[model samples]
Target: MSVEVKVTQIDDETWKFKTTITKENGEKEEKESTITKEEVKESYESEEEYESTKERIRKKFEDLSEKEKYTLSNLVLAITKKLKELYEEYGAKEVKVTIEPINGKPLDKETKERIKESIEELLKEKGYDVKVELE
Candidate 1:
């Protein structure tokens, strides 16, 4: 699978760059719940129980700290680097990197802008001409 990189021009010479992460050949494992039939039936029979279960899961994920979330992203980036290497070996032109939050909350707009600025600085350090526009 190919990662989609979106570059939207915000001004005459500045462009907003966003990377979307995609897995090809199922790199990420699918989550499966092994609920017993009776348990499933019980949950199905009681709306309150089902809602509570969902809320619990949500809370568990939300409780993770920002540092933990960044660590998760780093792990995923390692996988992304390997994929990028493979693409380069096959003569691919560019690889896109997607930024995603671990706990399903939308990234803060300020944070996104900071990321964009950092990327632009990195590209400049490497002698590449690029601009980031926040939308």
Candidate 2:
């Protein structure tokens, strides 16, 4: 029995992986899986690491202020990280991210700070000292 893994990048932010399986008699089959940015970002170790990671994120979220806690900080973190990863593929130094309120309104200072903090936290984890600004 043998197995092979191959990955194809569908886009700057999307990718697919194929697992080729070979049996004892030399029979072979290929299984392919497609995933978007978020889906492919899933990283987890078995039992112990899973619980450990859960506790870590649990504390990170708990540290947020009441207003920040209720907003889209995690989503912002994920998006900014994805953007950072994709932008780095082009050998870029830094990427600027801006978002306008859906209702044609501007983001408030605190709201923007929370969003910036989210991206900053993520970038900090990856050791990138860039910035995210909201409009």
Candidate 3:
């Protein structure tokens, strides 16, 4: 029923975090994960917005970043952990993902396709027959 997160900045652009959760069924589990600046910056809504936000801090990113560079775990950590945690909560069928680019460029269909595949893999691995679509 509860989760705790602790993030620690790593050497260079790397980051580490831990997720501790207490299940409603009275089980406890902890997970460790790591990421780099690439993942965070690429996951941003837009390059311009990311630049504007980081401008106040005078930070520069050398790698060209794209939107939706999120991994399966990143999506789980940021958006839909409960779907994984509460597997028996209800019925399941399909998942829809929408991308609205902030820099005015159109969303990359290829990127969304890859994301759909990644999420599809996760869902099937979880014993769910689900269709991931771009909405």
Candidate 4:
């Protein structure tokens, strides 16, 4: 028997998971499911508990240009690839990644926090045993 699982974000608030299975008799089957906050949870608390997490969810960089989105996604992809390769090749238990101000001066604390949270969320979705830090 063999099985494969793949997950991809479908949109701003949904994720798609696809699974392929091969039985011992050589039969193959495919299954898929879309996950939205309501499908998994009924409430959330961000200092207040709401009816659903959906109500509170919003894009982190909502006003970003297409170029900004592309660059940020690429950064996540690169980090994911490197961390996965390290775990596979060296049997690493965990990995840590740090993001720092590019110039001599620090960025707005709020900006740094936002970027860190965004990266952390993306990495967590990819199911990596990695830690993210802001410096």
Candidate 5:
């Protein structure tokens, strides 16, 4: 079995993720939920040391723009990591990810491009097939 995952922005600070599972016989199962920026923050930081304040400051994502880097980077990392867990949970050989972003507010053209690249890099590095779309 394998899964297809989608992460999409639904509001200014919230995003929704939906997962579709495909069985060997081609049957489909689906699940969905939402995530907030605050939740994503905790998830990303949870992987790090408790007292590594200085190290945390320097371990930022590259190829991202200045203003929205922090927001987008953490989001990308969190979603990618979530996909990793889903991959293991279903005992699937592969997973496909598609990300859709809201174009309004903080996500300008450059920021969207950076976000796409960041998500693709993160997922690919983890050996998942990813297709990121930002609007």
Candidate 6:
């Protein structure tokens, strides 16, 4: 028994796979979309102005006090939700998000750890594998 896999390049970094399983009994078929690292990076930087604006907004929000930061966090959540909705409405297969703090006041170690853990959890929930690094 052997499997025939038809791989189609949907774009520069995306592949559509159609798998056909052949056995003495019959054939089973399956299909899936696989995105490469390049695809993820491409999506992350898809909109130049959108990415830059996100950084600018984050920077401005980071300048606020604790109470303001809490409020800003809610704003960030709202914006993220809206962006996701827009992507879905626009027929986007997937959207990549990359968040990095600018030259602003650094987050405390505990807070940074919490954020990192939360991000990991969220990614897992979304069926994504995330790689986080300090640059």
Q: Which candidate should be chosen as best, given TM-score against the real structure?
A: 5
Candidate 1 lDDT over residue span 6-93, tens digit each: 4332322222344444466665322212223333324233867544543433333344565544433232223222333334433333
Candidate 3 positional error at 61, Å: 20
- Comparison by lDDT, 3 against 4, better one: 3
Candidates ranked, most accurate by TM-score first: 5, 2, 3, 4, 1, 6
Candidate 4 global Cα RMSD: 12.5
Q: What is the C-alpha RMSD of each candidate to the true structure, in Å?
A: 16.9, 13.7, 13.2, 12.5, 5.1, 14.0
Cα lDDT for residue 99, model 6? 32
Clashing pairs in 3: none
**Candidate 5 TM-score, C-alpha based:** 0.59
- TM-score of every model? 0.32, 0.45, 0.40, 0.37, 0.59, 0.29
lDDT of 6 by residue, 8-90 (tens): 33433344444344445685444344544343334443667445534544455565575545433433333233233333433
- Highest-scoring model, lDDT: 5
Choose 4 or 5, whichever is better by TM-score. 5
Of 3 and 5, the candidate ranking higher by lDDT: 5
lDDT by residue (77-96, candidate 4, tens digit) is 33344444444544443334
Please give the clash total of every predicted structure, in order: 2, 0, 0, 0, 0, 0
Q: Against the true structure, candidate 6 has what lDDT?
A: 0.40
**TM-score: the better of candidates 3 and 5:** 5
Model 2: per-residue Cα lDDT over 29-77, one tens digit each: 7666655645424533355643453344434456556444433433453
